[PDB]
Amino acid sequence: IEKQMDRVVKEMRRQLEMIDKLTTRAIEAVELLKRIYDKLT
Amino acid sequence: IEKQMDRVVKEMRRQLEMIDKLTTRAIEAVELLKRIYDKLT
Amino acid sequence: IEKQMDRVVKEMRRQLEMIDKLTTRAIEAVELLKRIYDKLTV
Amino acid sequence: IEKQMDRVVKEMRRQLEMIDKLTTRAIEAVELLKRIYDKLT
Amino acid sequence: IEKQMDRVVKEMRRQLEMIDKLTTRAIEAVELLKRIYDKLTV
């Protein structure tokens, strides 16, 4: 059971890393939106 | 089995926290788009 | 095994609800982009 | 074990459908950003 | 357990591929925001 559960945990850690990567891109988008707003203002 | 399943549940809850953070960045993006729209409008 | 699986399914459904909520915020963003575009056009 | 694992697979496929919906909203955002960019240009 | 676990890992990799596709769309969005900001600047 443990060796098999290691497989799932590994895949979960992969998904976490990808969600983190997606969040880094969202943060970049928000920062650009702030810049655009400041410019319009 | 119980100890092994606990591992998965722990990783799932970590993912929940990460999705919450991503959601807040979506909230931030919506607020900025709203501000941008209002200035235009 | 079943009782343990009950636990996992419950947590998976929490994840589903969170992705749904995230999607609701994305829809709001798309709607505002549509409003902004429509404004620029006129 | 099989009946129980079917439960997880069913929930994973529900999530897959929701991520697809989220991706369509990303596709929509990219399309509108392209339109906005074209108008500005 | 192994055969059943293969099933779960398979579905997990489907989710990974889908999240990657979503990320590519987000990157496209960021790139367009950069172009839009730059146009505003010039």
Q: Where are the domains of chain E?
A: 1-42
Residue A9 C-alpha, separation from nearest chain E C-alpha, in angstroms: 10
Residue type, E14: R
Technique of determination:
X-ray
CB of A8 within 8 Å of a chain E CB? The answer is yes
Give the CA dihedral D5, D8, D10, D12, nearest 10 degrees.
-140
User: Do A12 and B15 contact (CB within 8 A), yes or no?
Assistant: yes
CATH topology of domain C1-42: 1.20.5
To one decimal place, what's the resolution in Å? 1.8
User: Do D18 and C19 contact (CB within 8 A), yes or no?
Assistant: yes
Cβ contacts of B18 within 8 Å, gap of 6 or more: A16, A19, A20, A23
Buried b (16+ CB within 10 A) or exposed e, D4-23: ebeebeebbeebeebbeebb
CATH of domain D1-41: 1.20.5.430
What are the C-alpha distances in Å from A10 to residues A13, A16, B9? 5, 10, 13
Residue type, E10: K
At C19, list the tokens: 């992705």
| C15/D15 Cβ within 8 A | yes
